Structure formats: structure tokens, C-alpha cells
Design an enzyme around this catalytic site. Structure first.
Site, short mmCIF file in Angstrom:
data_model
loop_
_atom_site.label_atom_id
_atom_site.label_comp_id
_atom_site.label_asym_id
_atom_site.label_seq_id
_atom_site.Cartn_x
_atom_site.Cartn_y
_atom_site.Cartn_z
N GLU A 3 21.25 30.40 12.21
CA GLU A 3 21.05 29.55 11.04
C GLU A 3 20.07 28.41 11.33
O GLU A 3 19.44 27.90 10.42
CB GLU A 3 22.38 28.95 10.56
CG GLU A 3 23.43 29.97 10.08
CD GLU A 3 23.05 30.67 8.80
OE1 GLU A 3 22.38 30.03 7.94
OE2 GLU A 3 23.45 31.84 8.62
N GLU A 62 17.92 22.41 6.40
CA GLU A 62 17.00 23.36 5.78
C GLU A 62 15.61 22.75 5.72
O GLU A 62 15.45 21.59 5.38
CB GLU A 62 17.51 23.71 4.38
CG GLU A 62 16.92 24.97 3.79
CD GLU A 62 17.65 25.49 2.55
OE1 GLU A 62 18.76 25.01 2.20
OE2 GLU A 62 17.11 26.42 1.93
#
Length: 244
Positions: free
Chosen positions: A67, A89
Site C-alpha cells: 500500500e 496517497e
């Protein structure tokens, strides 16, 4: 406790490039923050024999390394050494706000893009996570990327929490999940594959994104080798239907 399953040396050998200048969260994810966060979840890494506990930790870092990876084909030492390169992100353009969710309403101006080792996203996940952690994550989601203890807590919370139809990742990896008849029919059997399915099955499993699944597996296999455990059966999810 956990420090006897995963040492500081092991932690930094796994995440050997995260404090490199080429990464983006240098000094953020510390071993100390990890050990502290895990205390809010006493069974995590503490269930079963030593091999099982090590396999749980390998699986947790395998998925979270993916991730947060900065890896690619030419990354020094291999793509599977570049976990924990990001703490949130890259693309922050979408607030990830579902305004139809009445239980966990979006706080105005706030963005629920991915944060932390599991890239926790959406108002409807920051809500229950904040409730369970006793934190104001719905009102102030940014705390999940400014405080490394909270960052790890959000990831471990995800790992430990069942979200029907999904079992928790914890239950799967510690051999506490008994697949339903529907799961059996759908090829969802206990192993790392079903953990990938829990995390992002709809976008990756059943052969939808072989590349991403292979990266998840590559981290996990590396970490299992370092811990001296067997990655086990049903490692891939290419023959599993996604959960719904």
C-alpha cells in the site's frame, strides 16, 4: 510481547529504504510507534505459536508494504525492499466523501484520501475507525498521517476488524476463520490470497490486476523468508471471486 516476535533490527531490515532520501516519509514510521500502536490490539501478533505469530506479522507488513511502496524494476535491492516509502496517497484530489452516508457524515472541507500503512480511505471508514480508537478521525482525518502511533493504529484496526461479508485479516491468518459455503464456492480459502481479497479484492482479485497482487505476494514471501516461516497455501487470489 511483540518485541520478541519482531525486533527493531528485523523491522528496519524489512523496511530498509524507508529512511532513504529517495523516500517520502523519512523518519515517520518508527519501530517504537509500531510497538505502541499494537498495544491497543493485544491479540495482534500474540495469537498462536511462534510460527503463526511471525506469519501474522509478515502478512501485515506484506500488505501494508504494498500500500505504501515506492518500488519498481530498478529500485536498489529490488522492488520488495521499498515498503513504507509513502505515508499517504499521492493523489489528494478526491475528498473520498460519500455524502449519502448518514452515520458518518463528511466534515466540511476535509479529505478522506488514503492515510497510513493501510491507506485508510473514505468517511465511512474514518468514522468507525475513529469510534473504535477513541479519536476524532472523522472531524480531523489528517491526524492519521501526522502521528505515527495513530497511523499504525488505523492499519492494525483495519487488520483486526471484521467488515461483513469479510472476516478480519487477523482471523484468516491465525486459522480462526471457517469459510462459509458461499466462500467455498467462490474459491475463497484461508491464506494470503483471501487477505488480499479483504483489502482490495474488487479491484485486484479474480485476475483483475495481476501486477498489484504479485507485488503484495513479493513483499510477503520476502518477509516470510526473513522470519523463517512458510507463506502457506492459497497465496494468490487469481481464482477467487471478490467479496461483496
Amino acid at each position: 510481547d511483540l518485541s520478541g516476535i519482531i525486533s527493531r533490527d528485523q523491522f528496519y531490515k524489512m523496511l530498509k529504504h524507508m529512511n532513504d532520501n529517495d523516500c517520502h516519509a523519512v523518519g515517520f514510521f518508527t519501530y517504537d510507534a509500531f510497538i505502541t500502536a499494537a498495544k491497543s490490539f493485544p491479540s495482534f501478533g500474540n495469537t498462536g505459536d511462534l510460527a503463526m505469530r511471525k506469519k501474522e506479522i509478515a502478512a501485515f507488513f506484506g500488505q501494508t508494504s504494498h500500500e505504501t511502496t515506492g518500488g519498481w524494476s530498478g529500485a536498489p535491492d529490488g522492488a520488495n525492499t521499498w515498503g513504507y516509502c509513502y505515508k499517504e496517497e499521492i493523489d489528494k484530489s478526491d475528498p473520498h466523501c460519500d455524502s449519502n452516508n448518514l452515520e458518518w457524515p463528511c466534515a466540511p472541507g476535509k479529505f478522506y484520501y488514503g492515510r497510513g500503512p493501510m491507506m485508510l480511505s473514505w468517511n465511512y471508514n474514518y468514522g468507525p475507525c475513529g469510534r473504535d480508537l477513541g479519536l476524532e478521525l472523522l472531524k480531523n482525518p489528517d491526524v492519521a498521517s501526522s502521528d505515527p502511533v495513530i497511523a499504525f493504529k488505523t492499519a492494525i484496526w483495519f487488520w483486526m476488524t471484521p467488515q461483513a461479508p469479510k472476516p478480519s485479516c487477523h482471523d484468516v491468518i491465525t486459522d480462526q476463520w471457517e469459510p462459509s459455503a458461499a466462500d467455498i464456492s467462490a474459491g475463497r480459502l484461508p491464506g494470503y490470497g483471501v487477505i488480499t481479497n479483504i483489502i482490495n479484492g474488487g479491484l485486484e482479485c479474480a485476475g483483475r490486476d495481476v501486477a498489484k497482487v504479485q507485488d503484495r505476494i513479493s513483499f510477503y514471501t520476502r518477509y516470510c523468508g526473513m522470519f523463517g516461516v512458510d507463506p502457506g497455501s492459497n497465496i494468490d487470489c487469481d481464482n477467487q471471486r471478490p467479496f461483496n
